[PDB]
Each structure stands twice: as structure tokens, then as C-alpha cells.
Design goal:
Blueprint lengths: L3 H22 L5 H8 L3 H8 L4 H17 L2 H19 L5 H15 L3 H11 L5 H9 L1 H16 L4 H10 L16 H10 L1 H12 L23 H8 L1 H22 L1 H9 L3 H30 L13 H14 L4 H27 L4 H41 L3 H4 L18 H20 L1 H19 L5
Pfam families: MFS_1
Keywords: Membrane, Transmembrane, Transmembrane helix, Transport
Main location: membrane
Length: 479
């Protein structure tokens, strides 16, 4: 490609990836409102924010990959942008929670067709002198995507549907004004619609302003490997090594905790501290997500600070920094002062994602570079699968379980057989003799579930240490 033109192509791909993660994580913002509207158990909210992305790499990742290395390299991104933005707005207008679940699966279907083609495009668009910092810029999409999803969700939540209707009517899109009443539409429907909708426009803009690179605009002298570089074989080279399995296990459990936590984050701060969706997702969710990214990068940086030689670094021997994350999290959860909560949480996130990025760096250091590629792929697959799939599922089913127990220990089942969530928020009076009891249970069950999930950081530390042992033999030396 050219130079200002390929710079533009890079801006467009980084923006696509930003939007990918905006549409991917905004759902954690409108958690509680979605629950109020569809009257869901936290176990269901977990079933919705976790195992749907089972499909993300379960099918699409593998066929998208196959289909992206083969051909049609720009059309694929723009098609998938259309796909996951359409699926998003469809979430904004879902009858049953089953339709929400399928629309989320479809969003994942679409989003799995972003990175393989975007990578191929940056590669064959950029010369090896600077391809590196290019891929780095593109990667920055995740961080910006998360923090911006939190901000835009907070902004668009708590937005009267009548405001949106009157706006659309004020611009001449009256095909929807009389079509349906806007005072009965909930703000998360608007979040979804406004976040997904411009994706179609952006996929068009991509299809139009982006030439496909000729490919192989790569490096010149490279003798034939004859052995198909790294493919299946790299797996057994890293599958021999048990440090690989133990680090991918510990990393997947770090992620299991982090994912469950974000999945019920806004619900927590709302139920306990009574904060608007806006506050919960703006004053806290976005700074927290930034701090999470920073803790990750800091962890990789403290690896790069001493992974030149000494590895799996820690105080001495085990990674107790995870263990240290544990009580600060628990403190955030067991506090009456919200300031306190925020700050404690900040601290522990810094530690928590530290040990994630750390593990990430350490992975690269166990295998030959001819295989480090597919090694980091397989590790991120393990981590997304286990973490995403099972983290919220545990956090939510525990929230139900621990609410359950409370009900049982106060035999409240007669009052609960008519319990919905939404009434608890602001409509306190018009519930019953056992109204406040039932809201207090809805909150404390989730509280106990959060405090329960962090204890998986014990499993995480256990795996980290477990690998810090077998590491030395597993290490890859040039000698």
C-alpha cells in the first residue's frame, strides 16, 4: 500500500476492532435493566454472558480462519461488521430471553470474523520495519473498546425512550413514532440500537474506501521451510511441556474470575450501593476497565523487565500477588463506603490483571518461535473458553444459590413465588410484608457469590506456582 492511505486503512481497522469490543462488552452495562425487564435469575444472566461465546471460537473462529487465509480478505471484515451490528440492534428488540440468547450467539458468530482478516491486511499492508507498532495500535482496540463501551453505555442507559422517539420524529424518521409507543421502551434497547446501528454504515465505508492488499508484500530472502512452517506439529511441541498447560489453566482461571466479576459488576454496585446504570458504568466501570488494561500491560512490562533472564517472577517462588488480590477484592465487597470499594477494587484489579499479562508474557518463553504463534493462539482459546464460558455461569448460579439459602434460612418461598427484580428498585412500598427482606436477599446472594468467585484466585495462584516449579525444565534455551 501507500503511506497516508495505509495509515487510513489502519485507522479504520482499529476503529472496527474498537466497535467490536464496544458491542461485545456493553451488555455488562445494561445487565440489571435487562434482568428487570425479562425477570431473570442471576443464573440466567450468567448463562447469557458466558457460554454464548462458546460459539465464538467453537465454530466461526476455525472456519473464519480457514476462510480468511484463503481469500476475499476485505469483503469478509465488512460482511462480519454488518453481521454483528445487525445482531446487536436485534438484541435491542428481543421478545423473549431465548431471542436475546440467540442474538448474542449471532453477535459472536459475526465478531469471530474480525481479527484474522484484519491481521492479514495489516501484515500485507505494512512493511516489516513498522508492521509491529501497527499491530500494536490495532490491538489498542480492546482497551479503548472496553472503556468506551462503559462510557457510551452509561450515557445511553437511563435515556427515556420518549426522548429517543421525539428525536427520531424531530429528524423526519417518523416511520417509528406512530409505529410504536416510546414510553414503554427500556433504555438498554436504545443502547443496543445506537451502538449496533452505525456498524452497517461503517461496513459500507470499509467496503468502499479500502483496497485489498496484493498479499506477500512481505520480506524477501526466506528459503523454503518445506515443513509447512508451524501447523499441527507446533501443538505437540508445546503439548509435551506441562508448564504450558499449567499456565493456560492459571490464566484461564484469572479470566474466569475477571469475566464473572464484570458480568455481575454493575448489578452488584446497583443492588448494594444503589447507583444509576449511568454512575455504575461511567464513574466506575470505565475507570475500572482502564485500570484492568493497565494492570495487564504493567504485568507484561514487569515480565519484560526481568524476563530477559529470570522468569515467572514474584516475591519469591509462588505468585502470592494473586493471593493479595483476594483480600482487597473481598474488602471492596464487604464495605459500606463506596469510595473505599472503588479504590480497593482499583488496587486488586491492578494485581489481578497483572498476573494475567504476566502469564501471557511467560507463555512466549516456553517454546521455539516457530511455534510461539500457534502457542499463544491455543492459550488464548483455552482462556476464553474456560473463563468466558464458566466464570459468569458460576458467579450467577452462586448468586441464585446463595439467595436460595437465605430464602430457605428465612423460609421466604411464599413471598418469592411472586418475586420479580424490578419492583425492588424504587417501588419498595407496593410489594408486600416481605418486600425489603426479598430485595436484601437479592443483593446479598450476589455479594456472597462475588466473594466466592474471587477464591478461585487460590486455584489460579496454585496453578501459577505449579508452573513456576516445572518451568525451569520446560524453559526454551538456545544452548
Amino acid at each position: 500500500g501507500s503511506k497516508p492511505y495505509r495509515s487510513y486503512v489502519l485507522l479504520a481497522l482499529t476503529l472496527i476492532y474498537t466497535l467490536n469490543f464496544i458491542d461485545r462488552t456493553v451488555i455488562t452495562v445494561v445487565a440489571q435493566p435487562i434482568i428487570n425487564t425479562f425477570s431473570l435469575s442471576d443464573a440466567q444472566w450468567g448463562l447469557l454472558t458466558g457460554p454464548p461465546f462458546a460459539l465464538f471460537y467453537a465454530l466461526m473462529g476455525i472456519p473464519i480462519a480457514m476462510w480468511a487465509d484463503r481469500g476475499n480478505r476485505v469483503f469478509i471484515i465488512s460482511l462480519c461488521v454488518i453481521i454483528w451490528s445487525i445482531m446487536t440492534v436485534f438484541c435491542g428488540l428481543a421478545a423473549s430471553f431465548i431471542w436475546l440468547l440467540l442474538f448474542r450467539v449471532g453477535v459472536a458468530i459475526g465478531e469471530a470474523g474480525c481479527t484474522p482478516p484484519a491481521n492479514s491486511i495489516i501484515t500485507d499492508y505494512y512493511p516489516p520495519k513498522s508492521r509491529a507498532n501497527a499491530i500494536g495500535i490495532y490491538s489498542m482496540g480492546v482497551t479503548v473498546g472496553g472503556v468506551m463501551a462503559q462510557l457510551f453505555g452509561g450515557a445511553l442507559a437511563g435515556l427515556q425512550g420518549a426522548d429517543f422517539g421525539n428525536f427520531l420524529s424531530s429528524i423526519g424518521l417518523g416511520w417509528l413514532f406512530s409505529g410504536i409507543n416510546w414510553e414503554e421502551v427500556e433504555g438498554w434497547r436504545l443502547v443496543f440500537v445506537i451502538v449496533g446501528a452505525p456498524g452497517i454504515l461503517v461496513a459500507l465505508i470499509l467496503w468502499l474506501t479500502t483496497r485489498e492488499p496484493p498479499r506477500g508484500y512481505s520480506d524477501p530472502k526466506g528459503k523454503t521451510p518445506l515443513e509447512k512452517a508451524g501447523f499441527f506439529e507446533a501443538f505437540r511441541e508445546f503439548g509435551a511441556k506441562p508448564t504450558f498447560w499449567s499456565l493456560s489453566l492459571g490464566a484461564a482461571f484469572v479470566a474466569f474470575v475477571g469475566y464473572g466479576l464484570i458480568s455481575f459488576q454493575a448489578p452488584f454496585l446497583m443492588r448494594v450501593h444503589g447507583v444509576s446504570v449511568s454512575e455504575a458504568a461511567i464513574r466506575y466501570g470505565a475507570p475500572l476497565a482502564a485500570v484492568a488494561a493497565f494492570g495487564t500491560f504493567l504485568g507484561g512490562f514487569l515480565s519484560e523487565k526481568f524476563t530477559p533472564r529470570f522468569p515467572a517472577i514474584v516475591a519469591w517462588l509462588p505468585g502470592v500477588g494473586l493471593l493479595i488480590a483476594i483480600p482487597a477484592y473481598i474488602a471492596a465487597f464487604l464495605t459500606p463506603s463506596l469510595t473505599m470499594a472503588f479504590w480497593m477494587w482499583v488496587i486488586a484489579a491492578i494485581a489481578h490483571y497483572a498476573y494475567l499479562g504476566a502469564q501471557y508474557t511467560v507463555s512466549t518463553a516456553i517454546v521455539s518461535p516457530r511455534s510461539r504463534a500457534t502457542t499463544v493462539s491455543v492459550l488464548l482459546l483455552i482462556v476464553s473458553l474456560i473463563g468466558n464460558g464458566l466464570g459468569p455461569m458460576f458467579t450467577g448460579m452462586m448468586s441464585s444459590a446463595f439467595m436460595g439459602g437465605i430464602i430457605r434460612k428465612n423460609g421466604l418461598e411464599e413471598a418469592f413465588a411472586t418475586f420479580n427484580p424490578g419492583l425492588c428498585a424504587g417501588r419498595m412500598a407496593e410489594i408486600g410484608e416481605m418486600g425489603p427482606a426479598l430485595c436484601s436477599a437479592y443483593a446479598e446472594g450476589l455479594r456472597q457469590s462475588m466473594v466466592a468467585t474471587v477464591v478461585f484466585l487460590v486455584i489460579a495462584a496454585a496453578f501459577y506456582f505449579l508452573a513456576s516449579r516445572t518451568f525451569l525444565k520446560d524453559r526454551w534455551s538456545p544452548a
